[PDB]
A paper describes a structure:
The target protein used in this study is the computationally stabilized haloalkane dehalogenase DhaA115 designed previously using the web server FireProt. Eleven mutations that were originally introduced in the wild type increased its apparent melting temperature (Tmapp) to approx. 73 °C (ΔTmapp ∼ 23 °C), making it the most stable haloalkane dehalogenase to date. First, DhaA115 displays activity toward a broad range of halogenated substrates, many of which are toxic and carcinogenic compounds persistent in the environment, e.g., 1,2-dichloroethane and 1,2-dibromoethane. This makes the enzyme particularly valuable for biotechnological applications that detoxify and degrade harmful pollutants.
Following the experimental validation of all FireProt designs, we removed the destabilizing mutations L161M, I163L from DhaA216 and obtained the most stable FireProt variant, DhaA223, with 6 °C higher Tmapp compared to DhaA115. We obtained diffraction-quality crystals of DhaA223 and DhaA231 enzymes that belonged to the space groups P1211 and P212121 and diffracted at 1.5 and 1.3 Å resolution, respectively. The positioning of catalytic pentad residues was not disturbed, which is a prerequisite for efficient catalysis. Here, we show that the protein backbones of DhaA223 and DhaA231 superpose well with that of the DhaA115, although some minor changes are observed in the hinge regions between the helical cap domain and the hydrolase core. The crystal structures of DhaA223 and DhaA231 thus suggest that stabilization was achieved via strengthening intricate networks of residue-to-residue interactions, stabilizing the αβα-sandwich architecture. A notable example includes residues 184 and 197, where mutation of hydrophobic valines to glutamic acids created local hydrogen-bond networks involving water molecules. Specifically, this translates to approx. 7-, 12-, and 5-times longer half-lives at 70 °C of DhaA222, 223, and 231, respectively, compared to the 8-minute half-life of DhaA115 at this temperature. Consequently, DhaA222 and DhaA223 reach similar levels of catalytic efficiency at 60 °C when adjusted for the substrate inhibition (i.e., kcat·Ksi/Km), which is 3–4 times higher compared to DhaA115 and DhaA231. The substrate inhibition of DhaA222 and DhaA231 is exergonic at the whole temperature range, in contrast to DhaA223, for which it becomes energetically unfavorable at high temperatures.
Residue numbers in the entry: 3 to 295
Write the structure that this text describes.
Amino acid sequence: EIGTGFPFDPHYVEVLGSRMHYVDVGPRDGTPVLFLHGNPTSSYLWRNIIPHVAPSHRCIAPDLIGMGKSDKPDLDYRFDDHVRYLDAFIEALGLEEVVLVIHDWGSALGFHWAKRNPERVKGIAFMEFIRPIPTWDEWPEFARELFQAFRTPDVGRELIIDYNAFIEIILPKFVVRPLTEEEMDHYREPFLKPEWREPLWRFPNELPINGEPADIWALVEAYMNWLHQSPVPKLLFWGTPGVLIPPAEAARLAESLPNLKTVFIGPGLHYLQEDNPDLIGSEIARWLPALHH
Ligand SMILES: [Cl-]
């Protein structure tokens, strides 16, 4: 049965005047494996994946600023805020070379950092990641009205801020198997009060859809161009029907990206880690040794 516990001792680092929480397990040296969650999750999303990798490699899984057990500074929580704080977290941990394991907005952060640090990135494992969405017709129909509403003035803030839609609707909607109450309560803990929910609303308002917002669209196109030209080792996990990465997109990536291994995880929507953590973790562990020449 999929584990609901979070058996990781807390670690904190002060950056830019705020504390960020992170998981840090495994050996203390070697190339670390940096796990980056997205919306509306935290390092809790990686709880059943990390134990597959920790016997062989250091595993570092930060909570993005304003999320998980990290501090809640008074920010807009725009994408560039998350870039700045994750850059400061990576710096404070002294990371030189890394393997990235990334999802959702954690993948936009990770691919943007990799583009800027191409000689530091030794591998990227990614799943249900951020890519330019050409129009609303390439957003899944069953979640279209909701995400259009999230991006509608006033309505979206009411849904996400006042009524906590990203936690109470989207999270269970985007896992195939049923979440348990214990798992929901872990996810709910950082957002029990509405003044804590700004990151949750800003993220869907940053999604690059039909050119907008233009700055994120440009940034995501840039790192996808980098990815298509980079020889870095790559590992993609995909499910069916998927959400950001449907099977047709997984196939396009299998054809286009260099040095790519793909793993089909079975039924999956967006939070693939909650549907098949053990295959994701075991396959990451099996893929890592070849990154060490
Ligand atoms: Cl989002």
